[PDB]
Amino acid sequence: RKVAYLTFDDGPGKYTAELLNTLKQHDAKATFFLIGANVKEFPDLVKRENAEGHYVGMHSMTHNFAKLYKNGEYVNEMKEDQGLIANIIGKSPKLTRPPYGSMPGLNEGLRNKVVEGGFKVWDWTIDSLDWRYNKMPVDAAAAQIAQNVLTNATKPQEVILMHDIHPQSVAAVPAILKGLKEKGYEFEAYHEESHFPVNFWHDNRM
Amino acid sequence: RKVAYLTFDDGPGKYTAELLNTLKQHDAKATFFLIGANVKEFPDLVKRENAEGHYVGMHSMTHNFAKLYKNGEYVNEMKEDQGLIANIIGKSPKLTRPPYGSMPGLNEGLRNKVVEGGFKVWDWTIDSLDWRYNKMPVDAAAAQIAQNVLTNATKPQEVILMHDIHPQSVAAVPAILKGLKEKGYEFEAYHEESHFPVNFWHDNRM
Amino acid sequence: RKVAYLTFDDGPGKYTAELLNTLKQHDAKATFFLIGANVKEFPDLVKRENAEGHYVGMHSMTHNFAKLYKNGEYVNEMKEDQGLIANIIGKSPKLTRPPYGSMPGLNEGLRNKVVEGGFKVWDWTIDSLDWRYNKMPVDAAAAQIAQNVLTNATKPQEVILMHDIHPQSVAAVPAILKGLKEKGYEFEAYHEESHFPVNFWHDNRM
Amino acid sequence: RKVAYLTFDDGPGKYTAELLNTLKQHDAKATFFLIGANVKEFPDLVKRENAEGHYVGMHSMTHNFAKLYKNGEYVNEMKEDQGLIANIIGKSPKLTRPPYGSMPGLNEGLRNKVVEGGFKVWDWTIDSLDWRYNKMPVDAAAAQIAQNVLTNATKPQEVILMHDIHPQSVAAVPAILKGLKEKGYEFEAYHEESHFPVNFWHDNRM
Numbered sequence: 001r002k003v004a005y006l007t008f009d010d011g012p013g014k015y016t017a018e019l020l021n022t023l024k025q026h027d028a029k030a031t032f033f034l035i036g037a038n039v040k041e042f043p044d045l046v047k048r049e050n051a052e053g054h055y056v057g058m059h060s061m062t063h064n065f066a067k068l069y070k071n072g073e074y075v076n077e078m079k080e081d082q083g084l085i086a087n088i089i090g091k092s093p094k095l096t097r098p099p100y101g102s103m104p105g106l107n108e109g110l111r112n113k114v115v116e117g118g119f120k121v122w123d124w125t126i127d128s129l130d131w132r133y134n135k136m137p138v139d140a141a142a143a144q145i146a147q148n149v150l151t152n153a154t155k156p157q158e159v160i161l162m163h164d165i166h167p168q169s170v171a172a173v174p175a176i177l178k179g180l181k182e183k184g185y186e187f188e189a190y191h192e193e194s195h196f197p198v199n200f201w202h203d204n205r206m
Numbered sequence: 207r208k209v210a211y212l213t214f215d216d217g218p219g220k221y222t223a224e225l226l227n228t229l230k231q232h233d234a235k236a237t238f239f240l241i242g243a244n245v246k247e248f249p250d251l252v253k254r255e256n257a258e259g260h261y262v263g264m265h266s267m268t269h270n271f272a273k274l275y276k277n278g279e280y281v282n283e284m285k286e287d288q289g290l291i292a293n294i295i296g297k298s299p300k301l302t303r304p305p306y307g308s309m310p311g312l313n314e315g316l317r318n319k320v321v322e323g324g325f326k327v328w329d330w331t332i333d334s335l336d337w338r339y340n341k342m343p344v345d346a347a348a349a350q351i352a353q354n355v356l357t358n359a360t361k362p363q364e365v366i367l368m369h370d371i372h373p374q375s376v377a378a379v380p381a382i383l384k385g386l387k388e389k390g391y392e393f394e395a396y397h398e399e400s401h402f403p404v405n406f407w408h409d410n411r412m
Numbered sequence: 413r414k415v416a417y418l419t420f421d422d423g424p425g426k427y428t429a430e431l432l433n434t435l436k437q438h439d440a441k442a443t444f445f446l447i448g449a450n451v452k453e454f455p456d457l458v459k460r461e462n463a464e465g466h467y468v469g470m471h472s473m474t475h476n477f478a479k480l481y482k483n484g485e486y487v488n489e490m491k492e493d494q495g496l497i498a499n500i501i502g503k504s505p506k507l508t509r510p511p512y513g514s515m516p517g518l519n520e521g522l523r524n525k526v527v528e529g530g531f532k533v534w535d536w537t538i539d540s541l542d543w544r545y546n547k548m549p550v551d552a553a554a555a556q557i558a559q560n561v562l563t564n565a566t567k568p569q570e571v572i573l574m575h576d577i578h579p580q581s582v583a584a585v586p587a588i589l590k591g592l593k594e595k596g597y598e599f600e601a602y603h604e605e606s607h608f609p610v611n612f613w614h615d616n617r618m
Numbered sequence: 619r620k621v622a623y624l625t626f627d628d629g630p631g632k633y634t635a636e637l638l639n640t641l642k643q644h645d646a647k648a649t650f651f652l653i654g655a656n657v658k659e660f661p662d663l664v665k666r667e668n669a670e671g672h673y674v675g676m677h678s679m680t681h682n683f684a685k686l687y688k689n690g691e692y693v694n695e696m697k698e699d700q701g702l703i704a705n706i707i708g709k710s711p712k713l714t715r716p717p718y719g720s721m722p723g724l725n726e727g728l729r730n731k732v733v734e735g736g737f738k739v740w741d742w743t744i745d746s747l748d749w750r751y752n753k754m755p756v757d758a759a760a761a762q763i764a765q766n767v768l769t770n771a772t773k774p775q776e777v778i779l780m781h782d783i784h785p786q787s788v789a790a791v792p793a794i795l796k797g798l799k800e801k802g803y804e805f806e807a808y809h810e811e812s813h814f815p816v817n818f819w820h821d822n823r824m
């Protein structure tokens with residue numbers, strides 16, 4: 001059983017409805033890590049992400065490296081973000097995705113607070129590098145991004161980092177779906193009852 | 207006859223219960239040097255350490271170089287720590303482990319007071335360097351820490367400096383227990399009635 | 413299509429000639445990010461780095477976080493460093509490596525100035541952590557550093573952070589060159605005509 | 619082949635003449651590492667150590683850990699000590715023995731200064747632990763010290779740490795000479811043209 005977990009960071013945004021349409025057509029399920037300010041701006045999209053079978057998790061309030069890690073606000077911000085999301089979808093998600101990844105920001109003290117707060121942490125196994133192609137002609141960018149993902153998909157479980165706020169990322173998804181389907185992957189959302197560790201610290205409590 | 211004395215400093219803390227279970231699992235005995243604040247925060251773990259055959263000794267109250275050595279509060283702090291531990295376990299340990307080691311902090315004047323007060327002092331023969339491995343995945347860290355101990359264990363008596371307040375340190379202990387047993391070591395606690403001196407000053411009164 | 417970019421920071425210094433010999437022996441090309449004071453102390457090594465096919469770039473004048481980022485002297489210092497290097501090798505390098513990395517020091521204001529000044533910025537994808545291994549035997553340190561690099565080199569493009577001003581770092585390079593070659597990597601210098609972005613801000617302008 | 623290098627630290631002193639008689643009696647050659655203040659106090663013994671075929675090297679002026687390593691006076695003290703010895707034996711020895719050993723005191727900066735000053739550094743491979751038995755009955759103490767050394771002598775080259783300022787160490791030497799001879803060891807003095815690295819840093823420049 002090969003499973004590909006598409007994850008989308010930093011949203012919702014103005015390309016997210018398009019992305020949800022694409023996912024629905026391919027019968028694919030994915031995972032979204034949302035920033036607090038955008039949850040407030042785009043409640044309909046948050047509702048729709050959950051309503052269409054995708055997992056909705058937290059990507060912090062400020063996405064500010066200094067506040068999250070050095071000043072130790074990571075858990076406070078994930079908790080706040082969690083409450084905004086719960087006000088819309090009617091449940092409190094446990095999975096967080098660290099802005100800029102957990103390494104080295106999420107130090108041993110913060111990891112304890114994550115565990116104590118009942119939160120999980122997912123990093124990723126494949127970086128799509130979609131940000132490289134910002135503001136470049138979308139068609140060529142999307143194909144490159146698809147290539148970045150397809151050629152790195154080698155393991156039975158892959159967690160793919162993309163950002164749905166970039167147009168070239170959303171445009172890349174059709175090719176990624178067809179390509180990973182060829183390789184024998186199914187596309188699933190994260191499921192809290194089926195948690196397994198995916199983090200740069202190899203901290204199995206998270 | 208080869209004996210390895212695992213010694214764990216700065217605790218107890220949030221990884222100590224797991225460490226105790228690991229030691230019990232391998233029928234290993236060890237030595238714990240505790241900080242007063244943590245004695246007061248985790249009295250149950252102090253009681254567990256002594257109840258399960260380990261030696262419990264003192265690692266001061268402040269762990270502050272200037273107060274302990276420059277201001278000469280070493281013996282006062284160890285005496286205070288001693289009493290807190292005695293109230294939990296019903297005996298007054300005599301062995302101390304200097305924060306930052308005895309060299310150069312524990313000057314002759316302080317060594318004289320240590321002896322006058324009936325205390326002993328243990329430094330170490332192997333530094334695991336475990337606390338320094340805090341910027342990498344825990345399992346990778348633990349493996350390198352185990353390597354440091356295993357490669358340097360060459361004497362019939364080894365006193366090994368570790369810190370049970372770091373996750374990578376506790377994670378390193380299974381490989382250390384396995385490896386040194388293969389090398390012919392038995393893992394024992396410090397025994398007051400069988401003191402032998404181990405200190406950087408080569409002072410056999412402590 | 414796998415390329416490893418060895419990058420060496422904070423130099424030149426007393427181990428750099430040895431490192432250069434090692435790289436030459438293995439027909440490997442690398443990248444050096446120099447501190448102004450060392451450019452002035454070791455001009456013959458700067459010249460040699462460029463003469464032997466390696467890329468020479470800037471790592472500031474002061475390597476001081478407060479001056480570079482809080483006081484915003486980053487671009488000024490990189491330009492001053494650039495001029496010093498230019499007087500030696502006859503080129504004006506465009507690529508800078510931020511002291512302590514770009515995150516979070518290089519705020520948006522500073523990134524704009526970087527771009528307007530015609531500079532580029534590289535962080536890294538692998539941190540060797542080499543500078544942290546300075547309390548153990550040099551060969552033992554080198555082995556653990558090589559392990560850090562080899563175990564983490566999994567992507568088609570890897571940018572490896574090392575420091576040539578530490579003995580254990582230069583001692584690790586032979587095992588690194590051998591190991592990554594077996595993994596299919598070629599060792600190349602940064603090329604300005606072939607810039608791809610590598611920075612923690614995901615800012616593809618620099 | 620097999621060579622044992624007996625080395626005696628912290629002298630000369632009031633047992634050194636006896637030790638020299640013992641060495642001569644057994645046709646054994648050794649190495650002495652002298653403290654400046656005792657070179658001043660015991661010039662006849664320094665002359666005699668050289669006259670009877672032993673190596674005379676430096677063990678600093680102050681034997682003060684803080685001055686030597688943290689304050690960085692190691693090379694200055696060794697050079698000063700070197701001059702005192704040279705005034706007696708008419709040449710300037712290059713080999714130093716770090717008070718308390720080189721690890722971790724002799725940091726990378728200090729090792730460079732050692733090398734730049736034309737000095738070498740010898741630690742040891744066998745610790746006699748002679749200080750443990752200070753002020754105990756000399757006969758039993760000497761026997762135990764001999765056992766400590768004989769039991770740990772397993773390699774073709776062994777460098778043995780003793781202190782000729784302890785009476786029990788000098789008393790142990792006959793049993794040590796007898797026992798190691800039976801194991802096939804020759805007793806040689808250090809010679810600069812026969813240098814091979816013996817230091818805890820595995821720094822092959824020293």
Ligand SMILES: [Zn+2]
Nearest residue numbers: 009010099100
């Ligand atoms: Zn993000």
Ligand SMILES: [Zn+2]
Nearest residue numbers: 215216305306
């Ligand atoms: Zn401590």
Ligand SMILES: [Zn+2]
Nearest residue numbers: 421422511512
């Ligand atoms: Zn640097």
Ligand SMILES: [Zn+2]
Nearest residue numbers: 627628717718
């Ligand atoms: Zn000494």
